[PDB]
RNA sequence: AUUAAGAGGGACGGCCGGGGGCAUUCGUAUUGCGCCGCUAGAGGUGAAAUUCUUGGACCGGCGCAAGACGGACCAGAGCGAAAGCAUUUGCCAAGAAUGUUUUCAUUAAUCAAGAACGAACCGACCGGCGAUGCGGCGGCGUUAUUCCCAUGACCCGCCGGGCAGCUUCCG
């Protein structure tokens, strides 16, 4: 975002989930929820997050398949949207990074949804940004923590 | 509904158009008045012809009003009575503002009594000035007159005026200004191009009759004012055939008077006038773009509009519907005038005396005004129109220029000597333009608008001297500070090899100098001296000092800066280098680490979901921001148990430290109690252990208590509570008789839920808030100490402040953002002078969140149920059908004695500003009576930690049991221990029900206790009632009465040392 | 401490493509395929044509200071193959053996997910 | 914090009550003997014992605590074998404990 | 006239489904365009040749636009009279089965003619056993939990109507 003599400064831009942790979760007796928020924080930055979901077999379970209905999905679904915009817009850009590094909106997520349907490997795959506020460079100065040199004139 | 607005818009209109009007008993009478001046003026007596030199024959007792520079004409004066007598102006015109109500008379001069050659050397402006004052001797003693004077019409100083007020009763409904004006065809009108000559140089300033120089310097402004008076009666015959006949023009051009008048725009000389916009509406009658069917509001709609979106002094516009070839051409006025507008006849500017600044703050007023109109919503008539905005109310900084007789040397410095033979004598109107053309170049990227105050029209009795220019009145400057290129210190300019360097060394002068920058670039570049963003505030300070100096040879002793002189009441005792806010970012920093240690700690069986600040310091909003602190360990006692200190009976009160709240939420989890007393067993244990983690993991001081745990880092000490989010919930679990669990409201569920939930919000919202308006913290803080300088600091709670000193930043609706403490200060005592509580609620769109169609619905509902809802309602998102934050707030009481108190305060704190010397105190403001309370009690300065917040500064202070050289500390110092607030308590505890006590908690020495009259009458035996009260015999039966005596003496016992005296009055 | 890079790797069957980038992989540094060391169209893809593609970017990170990479090897990907060409091996092989120190390897082949 | 008060005063025999009744003096509660304890003093002393012990907090806590547990216990215990069976005149009682769900008795269910 | 068919029609109850219609939205890939960095080639074959390139092709980065498509999850599963049906959300109408001590009371079946829609070994041959999809009933136990939203996930027994297997019996 901005240079200061041999230091470039920079701010969060993104986040996503690799090629091969992806390809991994989605195995294929069981469902997979997908869902996507449009969600603007406190300070402006509006965020567009994607969240999935697997379902989990139990322990005793001897049934081949663990899959859920078409409306336990929507049910499922419908948590999901409204924990990731209400843990967004309450907080800045600042507090919602320190929440997602350990992924703390996948694990309230997992606990919610399991009056529905059991689920594990939830998790936040990726966020975006569509649009950012007006660059302030006093906002930049708590996050990395001249007059110039004089010159004899002739 | 639409109908409904517009039927609430047209009834608006119709009552400020009436008020504004006036009646037709009124207009008979001064028909009446009229007529006797006429028949008074038509018989006076005749004098001969008379060298016009020669003034012997005028009797002692009157004064010719022209100052007559150079002595010396070339003419001569013979007095007739007047050919024809003409009412000219707007009463004809049936345009009249209320306030002031002038009518005009034009006096036709006689063609015998002028010369060919009386249009030079000011004979013709001579002449006329004698024959006002020959009329002026005769009509003074007439007793059909109340008041005769003297006066300047049109604005000119060479162009004098008499005035005439009835006696008696009627005296200020009207007052007439008598105009004499030459003969029709008398003068040539291709003699007074602004590029031809009248006045000749060597009759002006030389010696010799006929000296041989260069060509004689055109004079714009003199042939404009001789045609000025050519031209009176032209302008009344246009306006009758095109305004007169449509109904809905007048209240168009009625309703822009007032427009203008509210603004400041209309008054002084070069002030843009309502003969203007008269003018400018029968331009846009010529175009299609305003018809004769329209009404009063869409005209105003419709000629705003043009201001905004027309420059004039760059592209001028002609009413002049003939296209001659040999017709002047608009390029000639716009070399010889800032501001070119034109008339049939092409000559007359009739815009000569408007300046370019006074312009654009017209457009500048005009754009505002567009986007309350374009914009759909309540109140905005009350808003465009009924709102007054003063020049201090509307400007960040003002600057004062006290000496009028330097700005005559800043004349001698500049070239300005063909501008000051233009128009006579008067050096303050020639070097106005070029001053404040120099000031906006180099404050470009500092400043939205400049603006200057206008001199008054002065008004002096005959046989008095003519005021001088220096004595005219006093000269303000308004700046509009813009937010962006407040932060830099520098004004960056070209690089030195380019040839525009050279161009950029001569404006700044020795303190242009060469600067290298990390991108490699060689540049020239000026540096300030500003550490603290108030200092950075006063930058443009700065920058006026040096160029007037430079440019003008005008000191700085002549400049008189008023930019935050009410910093000091937020300041130190002698600290004036920041107001503070350098140190509410320190603390911010802390609290940031705190909470990514808390985002990491390791051992909490649930971890931790969310933290939050609710604290008046993380939003900005606290008074005195805290430092970092050092115990004294020899002032104080250790208990040796655990690590914390204990105050001293011999030493006085310790330094006062006031801890920050924290909110913590956990994880959520279904091993919590579900009973109410059994969740609080839990909580206590989470502080206990939270407490054992932190000293263990990052060696903290942390003191675990039921409620709250108390950590001391980097020399702050925070206050962590932890919540648990179904709490409310249990707490509103109520089992009816009849076998019902139902949920309901309590007043415990109620503050928990505000404690946890609503504050956080809050507190995180104005942060950002902050962020986007940096002066937000220091309006916030100072309408604080206001409010608790007044002694009513009780009841008003600390966000409800806090939210009214937002509603400036988001609908400032009249004017723009505040971007000086000072000026949103002025703001908030307007709104709490003049809001009206009690039918409208306080909107407060903390990041829109809401829209019109909601926010009309939410005032239907409030004036539906006014009665449940608070004296005072707030309305945010987050909080809506209610404000919490004024259900425990002020009483009507003590509301009702705000608003006197603030609008009391507002005026004399307005004239101290706008004083030209500086303020005598600023603290007269801050001060309260101290006459209305029953019984005053005095405390001592030695056991009162916060006695260096005080309003008056003692200069002596007591040792408080800190450590100057900064670093860690091993022992707890004592956390929010001060005596006034703990004897406040046991007062309003105990005598509560009898008396109200008053304190001001930022150095307050003196506690007010008020008696209840309703408490203190007799009144049965009640034994809920005994408290405090004996029984009497006087009337032969048991009653009851509060124990004075006994009350007095009390005040004494309890806060035994800290009180120093009680006396008691009546 | 190590100064590190990211080193483009396209493997077609066709030609080899060797390109180092910096991190943010929008300045580049050096760039040679299989046509500049042999005059041959049968060999641009040869393992012996990449085993020079490698060398000659090797020795020119070395005087910039450049002492790791970063790997990324593509196919031609889309409606074609998703194997490696012959040339990513010997290129691959002789960066490790100029000493260039090798970071994390990652394959950044584009995967189509609908077909066409 | 005290304000004023009222008392409930118990003696051994009933004529020490008459005597408080016939009791004549102007009751000097501070004197040289037993001097009662006000001022700034006070609010050291009452800072003093403020502070709160670690280890009585945690004994309190957990015996509360202790204490709170076998009551949901026996609740739960007593539930389970008074689920079902049927009682005189034949009146069964629905619980959450049954395997069909049942509609709660709240006001919000209700309404709903 | 009586009953109210393991004949039929209708209502009511909670669910269920890539069934249909209208709007809305997201996702990579590919293609083209704009700018930045770098410099002789890039592409294709069995070998080449058509083509693109110093006015910068190919490759690396950022963003914009357009046309298709909806993977993996995806099953011999589901839905529809058939042909056929797969991102998200909102709206409109319809339907199967199950539950029913509701209602009408023979209103029914098969059918040339006629009408709507329409890609591009053998036979109603009684049964059985396992799974599987939906609805319902009963249950020892685990697992979450309900301000709103929601009352489920698993195991066992049982009843129907379906998609299909492995087997028998009868003509
Ligand atoms: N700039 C000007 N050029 C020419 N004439 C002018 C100028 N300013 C004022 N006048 C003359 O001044 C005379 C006095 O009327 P003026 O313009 O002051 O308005 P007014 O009667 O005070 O009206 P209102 O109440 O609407 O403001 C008018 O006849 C007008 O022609
Ligand atoms: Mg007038
Ligand atoms: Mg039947
Ligand atoms: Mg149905
Ligand atoms: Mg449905
Ligand atoms: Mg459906
Ligand atoms: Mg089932």
Redesign the pocket.
Known sequence: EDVQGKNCLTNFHGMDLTRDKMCSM???????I?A?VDVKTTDGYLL?LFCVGFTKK?N????????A????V??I??KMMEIMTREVQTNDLKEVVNKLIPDSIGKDIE?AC?????LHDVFVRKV?MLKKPKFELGKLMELHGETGAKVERA | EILFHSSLLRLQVEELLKEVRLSEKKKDRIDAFLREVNQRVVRVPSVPETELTDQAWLPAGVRVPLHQVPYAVKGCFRFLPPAQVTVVGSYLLGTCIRPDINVDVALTMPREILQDKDGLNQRYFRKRALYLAHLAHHLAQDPLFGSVCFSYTNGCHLKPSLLLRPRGKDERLVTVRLHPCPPPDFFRPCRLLPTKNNVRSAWYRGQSPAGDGSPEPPTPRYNTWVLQDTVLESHLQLLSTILSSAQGLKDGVALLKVWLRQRELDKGQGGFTGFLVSMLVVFLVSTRKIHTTMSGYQVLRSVLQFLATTDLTVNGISLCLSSDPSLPALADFHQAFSVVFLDSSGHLNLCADVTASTYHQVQHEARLSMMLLDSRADDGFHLLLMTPKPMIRAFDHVLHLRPLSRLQAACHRLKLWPELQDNGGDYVSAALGPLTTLLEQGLGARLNLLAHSRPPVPEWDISQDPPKHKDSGTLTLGLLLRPEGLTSVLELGPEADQPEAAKFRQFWGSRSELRRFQDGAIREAVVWEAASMSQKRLIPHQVVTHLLALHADIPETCVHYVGGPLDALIQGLKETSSTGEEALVAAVRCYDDLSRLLWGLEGLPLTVSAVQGAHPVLRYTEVFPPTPVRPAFSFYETLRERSSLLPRLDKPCPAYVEPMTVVCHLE???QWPQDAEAVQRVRAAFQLRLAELLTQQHGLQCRATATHTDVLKDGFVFRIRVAYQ?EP?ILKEVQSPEGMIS?RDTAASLRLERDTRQLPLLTSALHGLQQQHPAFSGVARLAKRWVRAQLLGEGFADESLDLVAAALFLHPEPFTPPSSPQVGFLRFLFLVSTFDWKNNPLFVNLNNELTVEEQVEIRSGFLAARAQLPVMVIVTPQDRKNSVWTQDGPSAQILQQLVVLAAEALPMLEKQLMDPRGPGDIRTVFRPPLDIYDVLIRLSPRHIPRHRQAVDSPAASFCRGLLSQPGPSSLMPVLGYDPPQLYLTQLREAFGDLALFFYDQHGGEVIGVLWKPTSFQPQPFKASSTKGRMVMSRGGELVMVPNVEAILEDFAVLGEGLVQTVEARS | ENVFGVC?I?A????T?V?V?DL?????IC?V????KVK???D?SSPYAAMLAAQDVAQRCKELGITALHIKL?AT??NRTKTPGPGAQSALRALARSGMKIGRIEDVT??????? | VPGFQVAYVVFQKPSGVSAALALKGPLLVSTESHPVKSGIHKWISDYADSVPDPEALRVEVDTFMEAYDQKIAEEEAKA?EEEGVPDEEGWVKVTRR????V??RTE??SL?
């Open positions: 989605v195995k294929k007796w069981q469902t997979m997908e996507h567009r139990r005793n379970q001897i049934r081949k398949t663990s899959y209905q078409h409306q336990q929507r049910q679904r419908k606990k399991q009056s529905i349907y059991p975006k | 959520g989890s279904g179904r919930q949920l | 483009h396209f077609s069957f066709n030609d493509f390109h980038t943010s992989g929008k300045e580049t760039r395929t299989g046509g500049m041959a169209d049968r641009e593509r990907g889309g584009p995967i189509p997910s609908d077909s066409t | 389970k049954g395997r069909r769900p509609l709660p919000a269910a709903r």
